[PDB]
From a paper:
We selected the fibronectin type III (FN3) domain, a small β-sheet sandwich of roughly 90–100 amino acids in length, due to its ubiquitous nature across phyla, and its popularity as a model for protein folding and engineering studies. This paper describes the structural and biophysical characterization of [name]—a consensus-derived FN3 domain having increased stability. We generated the new protein sequence using the consensus method, which selects the most frequently observed residue at each column of the sequence alignment.
[name] adopts the FN3 fold, consisting of seven anti-parallel β-strands connected by surface exposed loops. A structural alignment with our comparison domains shows very high similarity, with an average root mean square deviation (RMSD) of 1.2 Å across backbone Cα atoms in all structures. Analysis reveals [name] to have the highest number of H-bonds and salt bridges, with the smallest accessible surface area (ASA). Interestingly, [name] harbors a unique and extensive complementary charged electrostatic network that is distributed over β-sheet 2, spanning strands C′, C and F. This network results from the presence of four arginine residues and four glutamic acid residues (R45, R49, R81, R83, and E47, E57, E79, E90), which are not present in any of the other FN3 domains.
Numbering used by the authors: 1 to 100
Write the structure that this text describes.
Amino acid sequence: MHHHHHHLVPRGSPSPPGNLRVTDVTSTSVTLSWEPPPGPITGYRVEYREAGGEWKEVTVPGSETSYTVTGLKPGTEYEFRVRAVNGAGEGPPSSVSVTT
């Protein structure tokens, strides 16, 4: 076995979002909810991909705590991760799995 990859992040960047969870799923949409980590937050990167492929991304407001990704393919395995951002850079992600 090899050790796990470390997420390299700038000192001063935020902790991961807390309590990340999927709060609604339809055959073409996924709603995420979370809580802000401590300190200044300037935004959140919401990243997602069909498991195994290429990652899409949307950045949402620092004041946001829920967001719905629409236009997804039915019956599909997805991976989502959310990273908090501030002036020092982006922090480590918290991730969840979903299927539509």
